[PDB]
Amino acid sequence: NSCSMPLGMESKAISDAQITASSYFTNMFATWSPSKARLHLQGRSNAWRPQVNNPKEWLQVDFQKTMKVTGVTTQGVKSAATSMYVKEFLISSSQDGHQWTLFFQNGKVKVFQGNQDSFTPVVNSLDPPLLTRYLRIHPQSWVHQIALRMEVLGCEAQ
């Protein structure tokens, strides 16, 4: 129970450089960049959104070391009056950036059940816990548009 602390998305101990994505939506007034994918961030473009909405987009955190990951927390966003949130997602991970592993639950790729609105954070436990350096989230279903603010829960790999 001693390995459930936020690893730094909300606090910015995970720096902007550490968060990347397949793509992200940007125009003259908005940058829905990967580094906006931070739990409870407020503002005009306060979430990651991919450039196009499709099930092959992804958001990635690089912890810059191997960490013990025991949960992921996700949250949608509101763009003015429009609610946008991910309902279902997959996770993949890597210790070196070369070899990736899809997150399985007892022999089957786990489909995580995510958000049901644009504001409530949903915590998804990872059992078994992940010892990883890169963590990728793969949205599979969503309401209106893909949008993510997140936190990673865990501890150092000691």
Swiss-Prot record:
Disulfide bonds: C3-C155
Effect of W142R: In HEMA; severe
Phenotype for R38G: In HEMA; severe
Impact when changing G154C: In HEMA; moderate
Consequence of substituting D117A: In HEMA; moderate/mild
Coiled-coil ranges per UniProt: none
Boundaries of every F5/8 type C domain copy: 3-155
Effect of F89C: In HEMA; severe sporadic
Outcome (variant: A21P): In HEMA; moderate
Recorded consequence of changing I91T: In HEMA; severe
Variant or mutagenesis effect after changing V61A: In HEMA; mild
Name assigned to this protein: Factor VIIIa light chain
Organism of origin: Homo sapiens
Complete-protein stretch covered: 2191 to 2348 of 2351
